């Protein structure tokens with residue numbers, strides 16, 4: 001399938017260099033199914049982040065891999081469906097840092113769609129995972145697709161802030177070495193890493209000051 005049938009047109013243009021890789025991933029996933037091994041998130045949500053316009057991304061959030069628990073991952077990193085409770089612990093932790101940093105009330109739910117609609121790309125280094133098996137699709141081919149996405153964001157040389165959460169940070173910073181691109185890192189917000197540097201990192205207000213510094217408009221982070 002042409003990418004323009006799976007992603008927004010600007011993204012289809014940016015990722016055409018890895019279009020065969022994206023097809024190989026779809027082959028890989030269908031092969032996993034044929035072998036009885038499922039993947040998350042849903043096939044139609046795998047490239048969901050690439051359904052919001054390439055040309056409008058001003059903040060790039062990059063995590064590691066999707067939620068491994070069925071019913072959580074939705075193709076926007078860290079987000080959940082609006083009816084989901086309890087929130088996953090990574091999301092709960094992001095929302096405590098959100099209230100500490102911004103002084104906003106806790107969000108009504110865990111649906112981060114409003115961030116995606118406002119120019120925040122919620123990306124993961126690896127876009128699929130096997131249920132109950134964290135990080136189980138590492139090394140399987142998504143890295144070349146997400147490296148293409150990131151470099152192509154940086155090559156626009158429009159103002160861009162990347163928020164890098166967790167262990168891929170030192171790999172991803174060289175990909176963001178370009179004019180009008182700034183990368184800020186912390187430990188990941190998951191249970192056992194968040195209290196080791198995620199909390200206290202103030203990535204929301206920092207991103208907005210870096211944007212304004214470049215002459216860009218800040219993000220309205222406020223969730224309902």
Ligand SMILES: O=c1[nH]cc(F)c(=O)[nH]1
Pocket residue numbers: 063064065066067076077078079090124
């Ligand atoms: O690194 C991640 N952890 C948890 C997530 F939900 C996600 O999308 N990415």
Ligand SMILES: [Cl-]
Pocket residue numbers: 088089090091190191
């Ligand atoms: Cl989690």
